[model samples]
Target: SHMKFGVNYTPSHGWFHAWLDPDWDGIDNDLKQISELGMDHVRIFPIWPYLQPNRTWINKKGVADVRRMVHIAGEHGLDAYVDVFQGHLSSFDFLPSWLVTWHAGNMFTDADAVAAERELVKTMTDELSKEPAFKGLTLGNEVNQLSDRPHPTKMSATDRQIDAWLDALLPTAAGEGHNALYSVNDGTWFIDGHPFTPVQSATKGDMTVIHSWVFNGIAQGYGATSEECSSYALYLAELAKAFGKDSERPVWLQEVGAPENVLETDYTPEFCRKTVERAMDCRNLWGVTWWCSHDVPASMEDFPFFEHSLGLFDEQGQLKPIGRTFGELAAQYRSALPAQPKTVAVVIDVDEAGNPVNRSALGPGGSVCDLWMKLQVAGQRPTIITSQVAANQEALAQRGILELHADEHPYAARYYTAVSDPSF
Candidate 1:
């Protein structure tokens, strides 16, 4: 199936708190706006403290707030994916006073906190799973933050903490028979730092998701082009294929966006477009959730200053140039495309049984053709075609080709015309 597109909404944060209150009118407007953008889903966060402010009690208001939003999304034909952070919280100080005091050199320890955290996760899964609108669950948000810097905990310890949280929630979700999946945030375990792996834990959930960003320095240092970005994405796809529990299990782009300030030159809208194009080239990838929806004030105190400009719409609600570019691309590829030229070409040969004759002998040209075929099968229109030099153009035209060009001089090259131009 084609991947669904979505956006992350952190309503618990100070900037979004006002928007998250039980104000249906404003929330409805926001939902309508997102739906109009042609998005299929929204990734939301269920604030730990807001849901269970204390160890023993659950907040009814918080539950209602989430339910209303989920219903709102469904009303607009958008799925709602809840992000559950059982580890550290966002905006660090937003937690209840008890948890805060417990962490601030107080007498409280791990034993004192384990039961409350477990209870919180249980109550959330039990409550949210009952609602059919809840699509999936994100196990934690950047759990590695707990061990980074001054905290520098061991890899084994971090993995154990994450496993404990997933152990409690995964079975609860399964028992409830909900379609919810578990996911971890980006950079939880980089190749260099930690040896911990979430591959095993992800199997318990419906999907395994990853968050990747453009490494500006790495891209610049190597003078990589757009093609190289796509190549790297394929490498990531191979890793996902190896780690994925099942062939149908999806590798989601839970979070992906370019930083406007850091790589001003390389982080252009074209770069973002190329990154997404590269990601789409990977068949194992499920979907991508862009980093944000709108730009907010950078000095809003609690907001992450660096992430202020990662939105399609500026703070004043004006659409950025990138927004227009994205819209044009989306509209062009959403269903069908007009006549265009092909940039990539490919040729393939198959045996009488329709199986590849020799995999290695097929070469990159065949690989490209295979990719185009997969896209076409998924409702994408291809502007390039390949065939044997002796193949009849009139025969192929009935299938989709407009014309055929053949060259037998350099080991037989044939190009079948497409209905649309593919220069872009």
Candidate 2:
């Protein structure tokens, strides 16, 4: 598959805490539906309790649930990314009762917790490694959320817990006989002040899996405009390179996305489309897995705009606006559009609206934005630049290129384009 497109999946209805036996039927259908839509893979989270109702024994049936996922996905032609040690899900607690007393982000910190996770990884990897459709094994869903800290004590505690856990599990993951990929679905813990940097994470895992809602790394209550959300994946791409400049593991946008609800903020198809384009444009990114397959059901009580209608598909498993856009894009790139030449991407301090740029609005477009519109109208493509991508200048030297800035031409030359030009 050329530049793959994937979705993180969970059954739409009856998918509340504890495993829904009925969710298996839904899972079967969901896999078939996603495969038919031109997507290449599905990321599934196996809630902790479902697999280990008791700490001492592996739930063979729960283990079979995983095998069933890969089984159905293969029948319909989609690979599976299995997320284990699911401590949390959709702002709700799904942790096993055994772990109730622990802190929010310390799944591996307690000696008992470390031992438990080791068994989980060991047991699951041993069972599913030979499955034909098992794409990889992920450590946990956003483990950083479980271990976020502002000081060395909490930080080192989780790190050491994971250290003890992985020190025992890495050989099973990739030592000599292993053939599957392993990663931790990590979050922005160090964005504040913590010991678990992406560089350290890269050294620890086979692939770096990043989860971001357009670089707002802190919380999910507030919202971002569509304009602000674009280019986020690329910023992550640059960050991944900067973090693992010396490491060679592939950086996967394990999770990134926008919602459809306009009430909280903008997360439109156009917004989703451009953001994905930027992810594709970045050279080092292995692939992108948008947040989910179906939107979680909404109740009148309290629904996060992020969780409300974030799925590419609606409850009935039909394509939503973002879903259509993604499919259309996959078609356009199925054979794939020609690769654009690499330009030295200039980071603009302000946005296309001429407002000062911050985390959300972090790409060159105001001026180049119009140029892209014109070029698309005429069947052409122009490469872009950003100072954040520091890893490939040596390799990029071998590719075609161009230099773009407002200083080189009259504003009229590009139809009053708002693209921002910056110092080299």
Which candidate tops TM-score?
2
Please identify model 1 stretches exceeding 4 Å from their true place. Answer: 10-14, 19-23, 86-93, 103-114, 147-161, 175-177, 188-198, 215-237, 245-248, 265-267, 302-304, 327-424
lDDT of 1 by residue, 197-246 (tens): 43532355676666554442223322334344333333333333333335
The model with the greatest lDDT is 2
Candidate 2: segments with Cα more than 4 A from true spot = 16-18, 102-106, 149-165, 175-190, 215-228, 245-248, 260-267, 299-305, 334-424
Q: Once all C-alphas are superposed, what RMSD does model 2 give against the true structure?
A: 9.1
State residue 365's C-alpha deviation in candidate 2, in Å: 17
RMSD in angstroms between candidate 1 and the native structure over all alpha carbons: 12.3
What TM value does model 1 have? 0.67
**What lDDT does candidate 1 reach at residue 320?**
70
Output the worst ten-in-a-row residue range by lDDT, candidate 2. Answer: 415-424
How do the predictions measure up, each by TM-score?
A: 0.67, 0.72
